[PDB]
Amino acid sequence: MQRVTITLDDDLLETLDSLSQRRGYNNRSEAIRDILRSALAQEATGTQGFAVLSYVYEHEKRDLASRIVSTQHHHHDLSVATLHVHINHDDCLEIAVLKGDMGDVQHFADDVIAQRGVRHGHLQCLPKE
């Protein structure tokens, strides 16, 4: 067993402690060691497949409604279908199911979320494997 010293800010530690107590850990190291185990295990996650793109945006702002649909049409091949739920008067929750090469999928995601007016962008890839 090796050792590693990290520096953490007060608020993070305050939440982490609140959690280590309740979740039944003897101390910070024990609790952090556990989060690492799960997190790294998820890193066991090739060129083609499907993907789920989630994100929230406001239809008005920079005419995003039109922009995001136009964008998706430029890559309509990669697009399978898009689910959309109106959450409030301004925001919209959208989920685009994508098919094709992961490279194209990665690019598609950027065209949609890496821009002003879009929040909570999330992309899960499901490669053929």
Ligand X SMILES: OC[C@H]1O[C@H](O[C@H]2[C@H](O)[C@@H](O)[C@H](OCCCC3CCCCC3)O[C@@H]2CO)[C@H](O)[C@@H](O)[C@@H]1O
The residue among 7 and 89 lying less far from ligand X, judged by its C-beta, is 7
38 near a second copy (CB under 8 A): yes
Which of 64, 105 has the CB closer to ligand X? Answer: 105
Q: Smallest Cα–Cα separation from 101: which of 78, 118, 71?
A: 78
Q: Which of 16, 104, 111, 115 binds Ni ion (CB under 5 A)?
A: 111
110's contact among Ni ion, a second copy, ligand X, none, with CB below 5 to 8 A by partner kind, is none
From residue 22, give the alpha-carbon distance in Å to each of 18, 31, 36, 52.
7, 11, 18, 34
Among a second copy, ligand X, Ni ion, none, partner that 111 touches (CB below 5 to 8 angstroms by kind): Ni ion
Residues that bind ligand X (CB under 6 A): 19-20, 23, 25, 31, 34-35, 38, 43, 122-123
Two tokens at 76? Answer: 């309509």
CB of 25 to a second copy, least distance (A): 12
Helix axis angle for 10-22 and 28-41, nearest 10°, is 90
Angle at which helices 64-74 and 102-113 pack, to 10 degrees?
160
